[PDB]
């Protein structure tokens, strides 16, 4: 394959597309024995050359790790996310599908078809890993095989055009808790809200309206309502055909945080719109309920954190406003104005990709991990793990020397019923000057003093998008 | 896996153990569209850490590669040759094998079992796949599937025990000519020659005796004989005794080389052994009679050239008088004395794994391409591709450049009748700095420019023995 000597497939992000099987990598430290499940993660990674002769990271193909860890060793599994852009491309020898989110770029054959790459989550759920990208319904795979099924829409009572790459588990239910944006088509202002029971079968779609077309990547999830923030990372027709990148920033609209009740009989007067001044998020750590308030914790930065989906009046980027940190944004439902209660930053320490151990989704919860931007370190850029401690504040970090980059940590649970936080953090280290990767495995709680095993791979992964931990049982592998 | 902190384990000897599929794989250059066939090649890659808690370079497990070059693209296939030993370790989740050539070192449930690492050669007869290690029978694959069939004894015809890794194809017949030494048992003195049909049938077996048991890893083939150096890299059950490596060498043995009849009934009394003094050849390019003399082309060195195999008097290595030029071998059939007719020095560069157009196997030959070591080059070795005409006189050498080394080169032919030479050379190229390999395709006769197409693996293979291309149809592969 002949592919663009640019940034975006060069280097770091030279195309690797590995399929491949290998047990038992060489490691260092000790693997718990108590482990017995699998991390998937999946990277953007292009099968073939863009179209346009340059794309973007956020637009390769979906390739899905997964890391089976049993028996004190760590195996891996490599596959594609054979989605119908995977699959019509791969028969066609050549990229059908053009730029980001741009159907305008596609070539007339594949007008009509899903453009997702399935390259933003490997979650599993239901006995299924779900390939996740926010364009589409999710695509579907078997996490013991890692085949592909297809595009998941419910026994046709999915109605919505699309379906997130930021799925929740409320532990009440074991319900996965879903939005689809853009669900009646590209740049509309409607919404699904989607349940579906552990069984994998749709509970309800309920369908609104939010107060513009933005990014509606992440959201939270309490025990009565979804959370959704509107942040103007903005798209539109109009800007596909002037060329554009279909998303850009506008430092000019104000910012929403919607409380969007958790019920199929939602209608749109049922909803509560808080707003605040201009101001970029993306990720949820997480959200939850006290009294009459709801309060949600993300990464917040003064201004846009995506430079390929620019300033839309022009402004180059700005880095140092695209630093984000830890704030918690809480609304209170009782509350006569449209004000947020509160906006309060939790940490000074500078970081994105945040976790929890999920099984605190939508309650009040002491721990959160994230991926660290600590500038003062030497550099030959997300060095760090970060745990911060809501009851304390008490904050851990670890660095990974001067010549690694971190990917977004998972949190393992050492039981069903373990304390919070109790159990593991795995995570993949970018080795750059080995040119290949590590899988380190913390114990959650206490990351400073290192990882207690480190698994080598032989290879390197691409820039990752977001994983999750299944234990075996819930995978189809063994007991 | 916790290999040992060796070099034999770590860096460039790090274990790998991918087994992976890529098509299409990144490029750079003109993959000629004439090419339709695949190249295979084979690297020792321990399966599991050693008994020992070291290991040398020749005792990892053969693990196979495929570049399947079709439609001006490369693509990769990797699997395991699954030997006996790799069945028997894998069940076992552990090494029972131990040292290189040392039943005393194996585990008590391995015993009466073939130590094949199949990890010498990957090569191509009869429609199968030839995973070749010379202490056992062959080991032989599907060429398409890369599945493992097993070991290859010919119904029983086959009594020795033992099969090279160093086959030759008669062009006037399109057999297989192949030793076995150590055929009736560690360190033996007696060989086998096999003659195979192109159907893969065994033709005949003949036995004889050597001067001295001695590594017999490579020979020569004429249309009527047998061309059998004798190098005392020697070995004994009294060195594994006494926990030495195998093989040692012995500068106080004379070298011989034999002529023996490719005939079915041969006797010992047929054979002429040729006697000179002491020095060290390992490899072929090519044999061929002329009149009533038969010549031999060698990488000749003063000494040894294995420093894991050491000097038997206990003389630390010598690097300089390990550096092996080409020298012409030739013995008159008629002469009254057994020493040589000449001994001819054909080039001053140094290097090792000769290679010709295998059309010419047995025949006079005008082209041979080497790896060369050009130790006046800068380094941050075997840092060249080189090419002698024997009917001119001239050299032509490619360098790699600073940071890299390259593996033993293939010749492909343009097609069945082009003229010698009329085709192109691939060989893996390590590129050291960014700890990946590529697959360099070179016009045969034309190498001072470089590359016309260069493949890029994204990940790094590791130190390889020999390969071979075949064409698509000799593979079962499409046409
Ligand atoms: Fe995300
Ligand atoms: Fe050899």
Chains 1, 2 share one sequence.
Not at 31 to 43: D, M, T
Not at 174 to 187: E, P, R, T
Not at 213 to 222: E, L
């Amino acid at each position: 394959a002949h592919f663009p000597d640019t940034p975006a497939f060069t280097g770091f992000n030279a195309p690797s597309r590995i399929e491949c099987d290998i047990p038992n990598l060489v490691h260092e430290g000790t693997i718990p024995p108590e482990l017995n499940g699998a991390f998937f993660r999946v990277q953007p990674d292009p099968q073939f050359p863009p179209r346009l002769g340059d794309d973007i990271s956020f637009n390769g193909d979906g390739m899905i790790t997964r890391f089976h860890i049993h028996d004190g060793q760590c195996d891996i599994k490599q596959r594609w996310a054979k989605t119908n852009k995977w699959k019509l491309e791969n028969a066609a020898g050549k990229a059908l599908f053009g730029s980001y989110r741009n159907p305008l770029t596609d070539d007339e054959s594949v007008k009509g078809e899903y453009r997702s790459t399935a390259n933003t989550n490997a979650f599993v759920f239901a006995g299924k890993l779900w390939a996740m990208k926010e364009d589409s319904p999710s695509l579907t795979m078997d996490p013991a095989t890692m085949e592909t099924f297809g595009f998941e829409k419910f026994g046709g009572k999915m109605t919505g055009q699309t379906f997130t790459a930021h799925p929740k588990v409320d532990p009440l239910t074991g319900n996965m808790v879903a939005i689809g944006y853009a669900a009646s088509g590209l740049c509309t202002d409607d919404v699904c809200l989607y349940e579906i029971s552990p069984d994998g079968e749709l509970i309800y779609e309920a369908w609104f309206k939010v107060p513009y077309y933005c990014m509606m990547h992440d959201f939270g999830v309490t025990k009565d309502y979804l959370v959704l923030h509107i942040v103007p990372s903005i798209g539109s027709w109009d800007r596909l055909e002037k060329g554009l990148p279909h998303f850009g920033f506008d430092t000019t609209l104000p910012v929403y945080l919607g409380i969007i009740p958790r019920r199929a009989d939602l209608k749109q007067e049922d909803i509560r719109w808080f707003k605040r001044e201009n101001c970029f998020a993306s990720h949820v750590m997480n959200a939850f309920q006290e009294g009459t308030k709801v309060h949600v914790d993300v990464p917040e930065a003064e201004n846009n954190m995506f430079p390929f989906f620019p300033d839309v009046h022009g402004a180059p980027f700005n880095p140092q406003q695209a630093m984000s940190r830890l704030t918690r944004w809480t609304v209170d439902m009782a509350s006569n104005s449209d004000e947020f209660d509160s906006v309060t930053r939790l940490t000074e320490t500078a970081g994105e990709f945040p976790r929890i151990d999920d099984r605190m989704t939508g309650l009040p919860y002491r721990y959160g991990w994230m991926l660290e931007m600590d500038m003062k370190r030497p550099v030959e850029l997300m060095n760090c793990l970060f745990l911060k401690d809501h009851q304390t504040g008490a904050e851990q970090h670890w660095w990974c020397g001067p010549t690694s980059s971190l990917q977004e940590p998972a949190f393992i649970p050492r039981s069903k019923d373990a304390p919070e936080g109790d159990g593991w953090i795995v995570q993949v280290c970018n080795r750059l000057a080995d040119h290949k990767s590590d899988l380190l495995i913390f114990e959650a709680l206490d990351i400073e003093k290192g990882p207690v095993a480190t698994v080598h791979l032989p290879f390197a992964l691409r820039f990752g998008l977001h994983g999750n931990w299944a234990n075996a049982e819930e995978i189809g592998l063994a007991a």
